[PDB]
């Protein structure tokens, strides 16, 4: 079975180069077909970067021709991508993908899982976690509590509500940029009898900084 | 570049319906087009190649058609798996170009949003910052306008919005609008109101607090 897996660091500093590896197993990249590199920008927009054929030839997108370099290592059966002088716009999810392959009956194309590569100059900067308790108004039979995670870098962050026993009515919103640092929030809706007698603790973890913050949501 | 334009850009549909997505190329591409499927979160899956041919493993309910500069993807009797994002791509000329994509959203009945507004925590105010959070949870449809007024006057700057994908249980959307201020400006105003605009209510949903309350 043919499988493509991408590898390479997920963080690059502006003006430097982004380099990824695509390890191919189940077929030899020298036998036949083109091995491509495409990226999906935040916004779902897709862009084709280029390819390396089985003969060693490369075809790059015109607008990337001066910054791109597609290379291979036949003996290890993997091909790489190198984008020079990257800027914040190059922040995207990279995919190595094949052209149309014919091993089974009908043709089939192979894709990898894709790795997100962010371009920023921000040091890993841990999150500030703030409990969002209700403000002193109605309520009703349901309470909505929150957890604000702001000014952190890089992505991602793991937010669980205990320790994980609380799964229902939980909404963890995606992160948005704010002056080069991330900020996200999460909300949990529990019946009004539970809290505060049945504690609601927000668990924020930032891997990149080996941080684990437990902030209890107590009534104001 | 060959400009492949797709339509619709999204569509609310029910299980069992037949859907048709089209891609129009800025020139004749000779049936050199493929259709891709991208699921939640995820990765990609090739659906059809050379305009009409299905790929190994692709269920029979997928079908492609088209000639010259007009191609179409048809999914007869949608299933739960079928709800994803579809893209078309032209491979006849470098640089291979993609369509803007079409998102298949599962339709459900209308639902008003539950609004909640939160005052900045004491912990944050000690630092010197003051973020006011408003959650608009479980609503339908996705179209919602959120106004942040400070003492009766609308505020545009500092408003950070964020939406979740369509939830797999209730099929609703949730929004989070945060208004970040400094403790200086926060302490100079008293009324903070998060105002939502949705068709499920002829009068805007208004949630507010006063900096002087507890
Ligand atoms: C080189 C090539 C690249 C790719 C495609 C086809 C070709 C092809 O050229 C057609 C295959 C063939 O020539 O037999 C699309 C596949 C989904 C079909 C991909 C978007 C892309 C960009 C990765």
CSV table of C-alpha atoms and ligand atoms in Angstrom, one decimal:
chain,number,residue,atom,x,y,z
A,1,UNK,CA,0.0,0.0,0.0
A,2,UNK,CA,1.3,3.4,-0.9
A,3,UNK,CA,1.7,5.9,1.9
A,4,UNK,CA,3.1,9.5,2.0
A,5,UNK,CA,4.2,11.0,5.3
A,6,UNK,CA,5.5,14.6,5.8
A,7,UNK,CA,8.2,15.6,8.3
A,8,UNK,CA,10.1,18.8,9.3
A,9,UNK,CA,10.0,21.5,12.0
A,10,UNK,CA,6.7,23.4,12.3
A,11,UNK,CA,8.1,26.9,13.1
A,12,UNK,CA,10.3,29.1,10.9
A,13,UNK,CA,11.7,32.6,11.4
A,14,UNK,CA,11.1,35.2,8.6
A,15,UNK,CA,13.8,35.5,6.0
A,16,UNK,CA,15.0,31.9,6.6
A,17,UNK,CA,13.9,28.7,4.8
A,18,UNK,CA,11.2,26.2,5.3
A,19,UNK,CA,12.2,22.6,4.6
A,20,UNK,CA,10.0,19.5,4.6
A,21,UNK,CA,10.5,15.8,3.9
A,22,UNK,CA,8.0,13.4,2.3
A,23,UNK,CA,8.8,9.7,3.1
A,24,UNK,CA,7.2,7.4,0.5
A,25,UNK,CA,6.6,3.7,1.3
A,26,UNK,CA,5.0,1.1,-0.9
A,27,UNK,CA,6.3,2.4,-4.2
A,28,UNK,CA,9.6,3.7,-5.6
A,29,UNK,CA,9.7,7.4,-6.5
A,30,UNK,CA,12.0,6.5,-9.5
A,31,UNK,CA,9.6,4.1,-11.1
A,32,UNK,CA,6.9,6.4,-12.5
A,33,UNK,CA,4.7,9.5,-11.8
A,34,UNK,CA,5.2,13.1,-10.4
A,35,UNK,CA,5.6,13.7,-6.6
A,36,UNK,CA,4.0,17.1,-5.8
A,37,UNK,CA,4.0,19.8,-3.1
A,38,UNK,CA,0.9,21.8,-2.4
A,39,UNK,CA,-0.1,24.1,0.4
A,40,UNK,CA,-3.4,25.2,1.9
A,41,UNK,CA,-3.4,28.7,3.3
A,42,UNK,CA,-5.5,29.6,6.3
A,43,UNK,CA,-8.8,30.3,4.5
A,44,UNK,CA,-8.8,27.0,2.7
A,45,UNK,CA,-7.1,28.5,-0.4
A,46,UNK,CA,-5.0,25.8,-2.2
A,47,UNK,CA,-1.8,26.5,-4.1
A,48,UNK,CA,0.3,24.1,-6.2
A,49,UNK,CA,4.0,24.6,-5.6
A,50,UNK,CA,5.7,22.1,-7.8
A,51,UNK,CA,6.8,18.5,-8.5
A,52,UNK,CA,9.7,16.1,-9.1
A,53,UNK,CA,9.1,13.4,-11.7
A,54,UNK,CA,10.4,9.9,-11.6
A,55,UNK,CA,13.2,11.0,-14.0
A,56,UNK,CA,14.6,13.7,-11.7
A,57,UNK,CA,12.9,16.6,-13.5
A,58,UNK,CA,11.3,19.4,-11.6
A,59,UNK,CA,8.5,21.8,-12.5
A,60,UNK,CA,7.8,24.7,-10.1
A,61,UNK,CA,5.1,27.3,-10.1
A,62,UNK,CA,6.3,30.5,-11.8
A,63,UNK,CA,5.8,32.7,-8.8
A,64,UNK,CA,7.9,30.4,-6.6
A,65,UNK,CA,10.6,29.6,-9.2
A,66,UNK,CA,13.3,31.8,-7.5
A,67,UNK,CA,12.6,30.7,-3.9
A,68,UNK,CA,11.7,27.0,-4.3
A,69,UNK,CA,13.7,23.9,-4.6
A,70,UNK,CA,12.3,20.4,-4.8
A,71,UNK,CA,14.9,17.6,-4.3
A,72,UNK,CA,15.0,13.8,-3.7
A,73,UNK,CA,16.9,11.0,-2.1
A,74,UNK,CA,16.2,7.9,-4.1
A,75,UNK,CA,17.9,5.3,-1.8
A,76,UNK,CA,15.8,6.4,1.1
A,77,UNK,CA,12.8,6.9,-1.1
A,78,UNK,CA,11.9,10.4,0.0
A,79,UNK,CA,11.7,13.9,-1.6
A,80,UNK,CA,11.9,17.3,0.0
A,81,UNK,CA,10.7,20.8,-0.3
A,82,UNK,CA,12.7,24.0,0.4
A,83,UNK,CA,11.2,27.4,0.3
A,84,UNK,CA,13.8,30.2,0.7
A,85,UNK,CA,13.3,33.6,2.2
A,86,UNK,CA,9.9,32.8,3.8
A,87,UNK,CA,7.7,35.6,5.0
A,88,UNK,CA,4.6,35.4,7.3
A,89,UNK,CA,2.4,34.8,4.2
A,90,UNK,CA,4.1,31.4,3.8
A,91,UNK,CA,2.4,30.2,7.0
A,92,UNK,CA,0.3,27.3,5.7
A,93,UNK,CA,-0.4,23.6,5.9
A,94,UNK,CA,1.9,21.7,3.5
A,95,UNK,CA,1.0,18.5,1.6
A,96,UNK,CA,3.1,16.2,-0.5
A,97,UNK,CA,0.8,14.4,-3.0
A,98,UNK,CA,1.2,12.2,-6.0
A,99,UNK,CA,-0.1,12.4,-9.6
A,100,UNK,CA,-2.4,9.7,-10.8
A,101,UNK,CA,-1.1,6.2,-9.9
A,102,UNK,CA,-2.1,2.9,-11.6
A,103,UNK,CA,-1.5,-0.1,-9.4
A,104,UNK,CA,-5.1,-1.3,-8.7
A,105,UNK,CA,-7.9,-1.3,-11.4
A,106,UNK,CA,-8.7,2.5,-11.6
A,107,UNK,CA,-6.1,5.2,-11.1
A,108,UNK,CA,-5.7,6.6,-7.5
A,109,UNK,CA,-3.8,9.5,-6.1
A,110,UNK,CA,-2.0,9.5,-2.8
A,111,UNK,CA,-1.9,12.3,-0.2
A,112,UNK,CA,0.0,12.8,3.0
A,113,UNK,CA,-1.5,14.2,6.3
A,114,UNK,CA,0.1,17.6,5.9
A,115,UNK,CA,2.1,19.7,8.5
A,116,UNK,CA,1.3,23.3,9.4
A,117,UNK,CA,4.3,25.6,9.3
A,118,UNK,CA,4.0,29.0,10.9
A,119,UNK,CA,6.4,31.8,10.2
A,120,UNK,CA,6.8,34.2,13.2
A,121,UNK,CA,9.6,35.7,15.2
A,122,UNK,CA,7.9,35.3,18.5
A,123,UNK,CA,9.6,33.3,21.3
A,124,UNK,CA,7.4,30.6,22.8
A,125,UNK,CA,5.4,32.8,25.2
A,126,UNK,CA,3.1,30.9,27.6
A,127,UNK,CA,-0.6,31.6,28.0
A,128,UNK,CA,-2.4,33.8,30.5
A,129,UNK,CA,-5.5,31.9,31.6
A,130,UNK,CA,-8.4,33.8,33.0
A,131,UNK,CA,-11.6,32.3,34.5
A,132,UNK,CA,-14.8,33.8,33.0
A,133,UNK,CA,-17.4,33.5,35.8
A,134,UNK,CA,-20.9,34.9,35.3
A,135,UNK,CA,-21.2,38.6,35.9
A,136,UNK,CA,-24.1,38.9,38.5
A,137,UNK,CA,-27.3,38.6,36.3
A,138,UNK,CA,-29.8,35.8,35.2
A,139,UNK,CA,-29.4,32.9,36.2
A,140,UNK,CA,-31.7,30.4,34.8
A,141,UNK,CA,-31.5,26.7,34.8
A,142,UNK,CA,-28.2,26.6,32.8
A,143,UNK,CA,-25.0,28.4,33.5
A,144,UNK,CA,-22.3,29.2,30.9
A,145,UNK,CA,-18.8,29.6,32.3
A,146,UNK,CA,-15.6,30.5,30.3
A,147,UNK,CA,-11.9,30.3,30.2
A,148,UNK,CA,-9.8,32.9,28.4
A,149,UNK,CA,-6.4,31.9,27.1
A,150,UNK,CA,-4.5,34.9,25.8
A,151,UNK,CA,-1.2,36.1,24.6
A,152,UNK,CA,0.4,32.8,23.9
A,153,UNK,CA,2.8,31.5,21.2
A,154,UNK,CA,3.1,29.1,19.5
A,155,UNK,CA,0.0,27.1,18.6
A,156,UNK,CA,-1.6,24.9,19.9
A,157,UNK,CA,-3.0,24.7,23.4
A,158,UNK,CA,-5.1,21.9,25.0
A,159,UNK,CA,-8.2,23.0,26.9
A,160,UNK,CA,-10.2,20.4,28.9
A,161,UNK,CA,-12.8,20.9,31.6
A,162,UNK,CA,-12.7,18.8,34.7
A,163,UNK,CA,-9.8,16.6,33.6
A,164,UNK,CA,-12.0,15.5,30.9
A,165,UNK,CA,-15.0,14.1,32.5
A,166,UNK,CA,-16.8,17.2,31.4
A,167,UNK,CA,-17.5,16.7,27.6
A,168,UNK,CA,-21.0,18.0,26.9
A,169,UNK,CA,-21.9,21.6,26.3
A,170,UNK,CA,-18.2,22.4,25.8
A,171,UNK,CA,-17.2,24.9,23.1
A,172,UNK,CA,-13.5,25.5,22.4
A,173,UNK,CA,-13.2,28.3,19.8
A,174,UNK,CA,-10.3,28.4,17.3
A,175,UNK,CA,-7.4,30.7,17.9
A,176,UNK,CA,-7.0,34.1,16.2
A,177,UNK,CA,-3.9,36.3,16.0
A,178,UNK,CA,-3.6,39.4,18.1
A,179,UNK,CA,-0.4,41.3,17.7
A,180,UNK,CA,1.6,38.1,16.9
A,181,UNK,CA,0.3,36.2,19.9
A,182,UNK,CA,-2.6,33.8,20.0
A,183,UNK,CA,-5.8,34.1,22.0
A,184,UNK,CA,-8.6,31.5,22.5
A,185,UNK,CA,-11.5,30.9,24.8
A,186,UNK,CA,-13.7,27.9,25.8
A,187,UNK,CA,-17.1,27.7,27.4
A,188,UNK,CA,-19.0,25.0,29.3
A,189,UNK,CA,-22.7,24.9,29.9
A,190,UNK,CA,-23.7,23.0,33.1
A,191,UNK,CA,-27.0,22.9,34.9
A,192,UNK,CA,-27.3,25.7,37.6
A,193,UNK,CA,-27.5,23.3,40.5
A,194,UNK,CA,-24.0,21.7,39.7
A,195,UNK,CA,-21.9,24.8,40.0
A,196,UNK,CA,-20.6,26.0,42.2
A,197,UNK,CA,-21.2,23.0,44.5
A,198,UNK,CA,-19.8,20.7,41.8
A,199,UNK,CA,-16.5,22.4,40.9
A,200,UNK,CA,-15.7,23.4,37.3
A,201,UNK,CA,-12.0,23.6,36.7
A,202,UNK,CA,-10.5,24.7,33.4
A,203,UNK,CA,-7.3,22.9,32.3
A,204,UNK,CA,-5.1,24.7,29.9
A,205,UNK,CA,-1.9,23.1,28.7
A,206,UNK,CA,0.8,24.7,26.5
A,207,UNK,CA,3.2,22.0,25.2
A,208,UNK,CA,5.8,24.4,23.7
A,209,UNK,CA,6.5,25.8,27.1
A,210,UNK,CA,5.8,22.8,29.4
A,211,UNK,CA,3.0,24.7,31.1
A,212,UNK,CA,-0.1,23.3,32.8
A,213,UNK,CA,-2.5,25.8,34.3
A,214,UNK,CA,-5.6,24.8,36.3
A,215,UNK,CA,-7.9,27.7,36.8
A,216,UNK,CA,-11.1,27.1,38.8
A,217,UNK,CA,-14.2,29.0,37.8
A,218,UNK,CA,-15.5,30.5,41.1
A,219,UNK,CA,-18.6,32.8,41.4
A,220,UNK,CA,-17.7,36.5,41.5
B,1,UNK,CA,-3.2,31.2,-14.8
B,2,UNK,CA,-6.3,29.2,-15.6
B,3,UNK,CA,-9.1,30.6,-13.4
B,4,UNK,CA,-11.3,27.7,-12.2
B,5,UNK,CA,-14.4,29.2,-10.6
B,6,UNK,CA,-16.7,27.0,-8.4
B,7,UNK,CA,-20.3,27.6,-7.4
B,8,UNK,CA,-22.0,27.4,-5.1
B,9,UNK,CA,-19.5,28.3,-2.4
B,10,UNK,CA,-21.5,26.3,0.2
B,11,UNK,CA,-24.9,24.7,0.6
B,12,UNK,CA,-27.3,23.6,3.3
B,13,UNK,CA,-28.6,20.2,2.4
B,14,UNK,CA,-30.3,17.1,4.0
B,15,UNK,CA,-29.2,13.4,4.0
B,16,UNK,CA,-30.7,11.7,1.0
B,17,UNK,CA,-30.6,14.8,-1.3
B,18,UNK,CA,-28.7,15.0,-4.6
B,19,UNK,CA,-26.2,17.8,-5.0
B,20,UNK,CA,-24.4,19.3,-8.0
B,21,UNK,CA,-21.2,21.3,-7.8
B,22,UNK,CA,-19.8,23.1,-10.9
B,23,UNK,CA,-16.4,24.5,-11.9
B,24,UNK,CA,-15.9,26.7,-14.9
B,25,UNK,CA,-12.5,27.2,-16.3
B,26,UNK,CA,-11.3,30.4,-18.0
B,27,UNK,CA,-10.5,28.4,-21.1
B,28,UNK,CA,-10.9,24.9,-22.6
B,29,UNK,CA,-9.1,22.4,-20.4
B,30,UNK,CA,-9.8,19.2,-22.3
B,31,UNK,CA,-11.4,17.2,-19.5
B,32,UNK,CA,-8.1,17.6,-17.5
B,33,UNK,CA,-9.8,18.2,-14.1
B,34,UNK,CA,-10.1,16.3,-10.9
B,35,UNK,CA,-12.4,16.6,-7.9
B,36,UNK,CA,-11.0,16.5,-4.3
B,37,UNK,CA,-12.7,16.0,-1.0
B,38,UNK,CA,-11.4,17.5,2.2
B,39,UNK,CA,-13.0,16.3,5.5
B,40,UNK,CA,-13.1,18.0,8.9
B,41,UNK,CA,-10.0,19.0,10.1
B,42,UNK,CA,-8.2,16.7,7.9
B,43,UNK,CA,-6.7,15.5,4.8
B,44,UNK,CA,-7.6,15.1,1.2
B,45,UNK,CA,-9.2,12.4,-0.9
B,46,UNK,CA,-9.2,12.3,-4.7
B,47,UNK,CA,-12.8,11.7,-6.1
B,48,UNK,CA,-12.7,11.7,-9.9
B,49,UNK,CA,-10.0,12.3,-12.5
B,50,UNK,CA,-10.1,13.2,-16.2
B,51,UNK,CA,-13.5,14.8,-15.7
B,52,UNK,CA,-15.6,11.6,-15.6
B,53,UNK,CA,-13.5,8.8,-14.1
B,54,UNK,CA,-13.8,7.7,-10.4
B,55,UNK,CA,-10.8,6.7,-8.4
B,56,UNK,CA,-10.2,3.3,-6.7
B,57,UNK,CA,-12.4,3.1,-3.6
B,58,UNK,CA,-14.8,6.0,-4.4
B,59,UNK,CA,-18.4,4.9,-3.8
B,60,UNK,CA,-20.7,4.8,-6.9
B,61,UNK,CA,-22.8,7.8,-5.8
B,62,UNK,CA,-20.1,10.2,-7.1
B,63,UNK,CA,-20.2,11.3,-10.7
B,64,UNK,CA,-18.4,13.8,-12.9
B,65,UNK,CA,-19.4,15.4,-16.1
B,66,UNK,CA,-18.3,18.3,-18.4
B,67,UNK,CA,-16.6,19.3,-21.6
B,68,UNK,CA,-14.4,22.2,-22.7
B,69,UNK,CA,-14.6,24.7,-19.8
B,70,UNK,CA,-17.6,23.4,-17.8
B,71,UNK,CA,-17.4,20.5,-15.5
B,72,UNK,CA,-19.7,19.2,-12.8
B,73,UNK,CA,-19.6,16.9,-9.7
B,74,UNK,CA,-22.8,15.1,-8.7
B,75,UNK,CA,-23.5,13.3,-5.4
B,76,UNK,CA,-26.7,11.3,-5.7
B,77,UNK,CA,-28.3,10.6,-2.3
B,78,UNK,CA,-25.9,12.3,0.2
B,79,UNK,CA,-24.7,10.4,3.3
B,80,UNK,CA,-23.2,11.6,6.5
B,81,UNK,CA,-19.7,11.0,5.2
B,82,UNK,CA,-20.5,13.2,2.2
B,83,UNK,CA,-20.7,16.4,4.3
B,84,UNK,CA,-17.3,18.0,3.7
B,85,UNK,CA,-15.4,20.4,1.4
B,86,UNK,CA,-15.1,19.9,-2.4
B,87,UNK,CA,-12.4,21.3,-4.7
B,88,UNK,CA,-11.8,21.1,-8.4
B,89,UNK,CA,-8.4,21.4,-9.9
B,90,UNK,CA,-7.1,22.1,-13.4
B,91,UNK,CA,-4.0,20.0,-14.3
B,92,UNK,CA,-3.6,20.8,-18.0
B,93,UNK,CA,-1.4,23.9,-17.5
B,94,UNK,CA,1.2,25.1,-15.0
B,95,UNK,CA,0.6,26.2,-12.4
B,96,UNK,CA,-2.1,23.7,-11.6
B,97,UNK,CA,-5.0,25.8,-10.2
B,98,UNK,CA,-7.8,25.0,-7.7
B,99,UNK,CA,-11.3,26.2,-7.3
B,100,UNK,CA,-12.4,28.3,-4.2
B,101,UNK,CA,-14.1,25.2,-2.8
B,102,UNK,CA,-17.7,24.4,-1.9
B,103,UNK,CA,-18.8,23.4,1.7
B,104,UNK,CA,-21.7,21.0,2.1
B,105,UNK,CA,-23.4,22.0,5.3
B,106,UNK,CA,-26.2,19.8,6.8
B,107,UNK,CA,-29.4,21.7,7.1
B,108,UNK,CA,-31.5,21.7,10.3
B,109,UNK,CA,-34.2,23.9,11.8
B,110,UNK,CA,-33.6,27.5,12.9
B,111,UNK,CA,-32.2,28.0,16.5
B,112,UNK,CA,-31.7,31.2,18.4
B,113,UNK,CA,-28.4,31.9,20.0
B,114,UNK,CA,-27.8,31.7,23.8
B,115,UNK,CA,-25.9,34.9,24.6
B,116,UNK,CA,-23.5,35.3,27.5
B,117,UNK,CA,-21.4,38.4,28.4
B,118,UNK,CA,-18.4,38.2,30.8
B,119,UNK,CA,-16.7,41.1,32.7
B,120,UNK,CA,-13.0,41.2,32.8
B,121,UNK,CA,-11.7,39.0,35.7
B,122,UNK,CA,-9.9,40.6,38.7
B,123,UNK,CA,-6.7,38.7,37.9
B,124,UNK,CA,-6.6,40.3,34.5
B,125,UNK,CA,-7.3,43.8,35.8
B,126,UNK,CA,-4.4,43.5,38.1
B,127,UNK,CA,-2.2,43.2,35.1
B,128,UNK,CA,-3.7,46.2,33.4
B,129,UNK,CA,-5.8,44.6,30.7
B,130,UNK,CA,-9.5,44.1,30.4
B,131,UNK,CA,-11.1,41.7,27.9
B,132,UNK,CA,-14.9,41.5,27.7
B,133,UNK,CA,-16.0,38.1,26.3
B,134,UNK,CA,-19.4,37.4,24.6
B,135,UNK,CA,-20.4,33.9,23.6
B,136,UNK,CA,-23.2,33.3,21.1
B,137,UNK,CA,-23.9,29.6,21.4
B,138,UNK,CA,-25.8,27.0,19.4
B,139,UNK,CA,-27.5,29.1,16.7
B,140,UNK,CA,-28.8,28.6,13.1
B,141,UNK,CA,-28.2,29.6,10.5
B,142,UNK,CA,-24.6,30.7,10.5
B,143,UNK,CA,-25.5,34.3,9.5
B,144,UNK,CA,-25.1,36.5,12.6
B,145,UNK,CA,-24.1,40.1,13.2
B,146,UNK,CA,-22.5,41.2,16.5
B,147,UNK,CA,-22.3,44.7,17.7
B,148,UNK,CA,-20.3,45.8,20.8
B,149,UNK,CA,-21.5,49.1,22.3
B,150,UNK,CA,-19.7,51.0,25.1
B,151,UNK,CA,-22.1,53.3,26.9
B,152,UNK,CA,-24.5,53.3,24.0
B,153,UNK,CA,-21.9,53.9,21.3
B,154,UNK,CA,-20.7,51.2,18.9
B,155,UNK,CA,-17.1,50.0,19.2
B,156,UNK,CA,-15.3,48.5,16.2
B,157,UNK,CA,-11.6,48.2,17.3
B,158,UNK,CA,-10.3,45.5,19.5
B,159,UNK,CA,-13.2,43.2,18.5
B,160,UNK,CA,-11.9,39.7,17.9
B,161,UNK,CA,-14.4,37.2,16.5
B,162,UNK,CA,-14.1,33.4,16.2
B,163,UNK,CA,-16.5,30.7,15.0
B,164,UNK,CA,-16.6,26.9,15.4
B,165,UNK,CA,-17.3,24.5,12.6
B,166,UNK,CA,-20.8,23.1,12.4
B,167,UNK,CA,-21.2,20.9,15.5
B,168,UNK,CA,-21.9,17.2,14.8
B,169,UNK,CA,-24.5,16.8,17.5
B,170,UNK,CA,-27.0,19.7,17.1
B,171,UNK,CA,-25.5,21.0,13.8
B,172,UNK,CA,-25.4,24.5,15.2
B,173,UNK,CA,-22.7,27.2,15.1
B,174,UNK,CA,-21.2,29.1,18.0
B,175,UNK,CA,-19.5,32.5,18.0
B,176,UNK,CA,-17.1,34.2,20.4
B,177,UNK,CA,-16.5,37.9,20.2
B,178,UNK,CA,-13.9,39.3,22.6
B,179,UNK,CA,-13.5,43.1,23.2
B,180,UNK,CA,-9.9,43.8,24.4
B,181,UNK,CA,-9.3,47.1,26.1
B,182,UNK,CA,-6.7,48.4,28.5
B,183,UNK,CA,-7.6,48.8,32.2
B,184,UNK,CA,-7.3,52.6,31.6
B,185,UNK,CA,-10.1,52.8,29.0
B,186,UNK,CA,-12.1,50.1,30.8
B,187,UNK,CA,-12.4,52.2,34.0
B,188,UNK,CA,-13.5,55.2,32.0
B,189,UNK,CA,-16.8,53.7,30.8
B,190,UNK,CA,-19.7,52.0,32.5
B,191,UNK,CA,-22.0,50.2,30.1
B,192,UNK,CA,-20.7,47.3,28.0
B,193,UNK,CA,-23.3,45.6,25.8
B,194,UNK,CA,-22.9,42.7,23.4
B,195,UNK,CA,-25.6,43.0,20.8
B,196,UNK,CA,-26.5,40.1,18.3
B,197,UNK,CA,-28.5,40.3,15.1
B,198,UNK,CA,-30.3,37.1,14.0
B,199,UNK,CA,-33.4,36.3,12.0
B,200,UNK,CA,-34.8,34.2,14.9
B,201,UNK,CA,-35.6,37.5,16.6
B,202,UNK,CA,-37.2,40.7,15.2
B,203,UNK,CA,-35.4,42.6,18.0
B,204,UNK,CA,-31.6,42.2,18.6
B,205,UNK,CA,-30.5,39.9,21.4
B,206,UNK,CA,-28.9,42.3,23.9
B,207,UNK,CA,-26.6,41.2,26.8
B,208,UNK,CA,-24.9,43.7,29.0
B,209,UNK,CA,-23.3,44.4,32.3
B,210,UNK,CA,-22.1,47.5,34.2
B,211,UNK,CA,-18.6,47.9,35.4
B,212,UNK,CA,-20.0,48.9,38.8
B,213,UNK,CA,-22.0,45.7,39.4
B,214,UNK,CA,-20.2,42.8,41.2
C,1,LIG,C1,1.0,16.2,-12.0
C,1,LIG,C2,-0.4,16.2,-11.4
C,1,LIG,C3,-0.6,16.8,-10.1
C,1,LIG,C4,-1.8,16.7,-9.5
C,1,LIG,C5,-2.9,16.3,-10.1
C,1,LIG,C6,-2.8,15.7,-11.4
C,1,LIG,C7,-1.6,15.7,-12.0
C,1,LIG,C8,-1.5,15.1,-13.3
C,1,LIG,O1,-0.7,15.6,-14.2
C,1,LIG,C9,-2.6,14.2,-13.9
C,1,LIG,C10,-2.1,12.8,-13.7
C,1,LIG,C11,-1.6,12.2,-14.9
C,1,LIG,O2,-0.9,13.0,-15.7
C,1,LIG,O3,-1.8,11.0,-15.2
C,1,LIG,C12,-4.1,16.4,-9.1
C,1,LIG,C13,-4.5,15.0,-8.7
C,1,LIG,C14,-5.6,15.1,-7.7
C,1,LIG,C15,-5.1,14.3,-9.9
C,1,LIG,C16,-3.5,17.1,-7.9
C,1,LIG,C17,-4.1,18.4,-7.5
C,1,LIG,C18,-2.1,17.4,-8.3
C,1,LIG,C19,-1.8,18.9,-8.2
C,1,LIG,C20,-1.4,17.0,-6.9
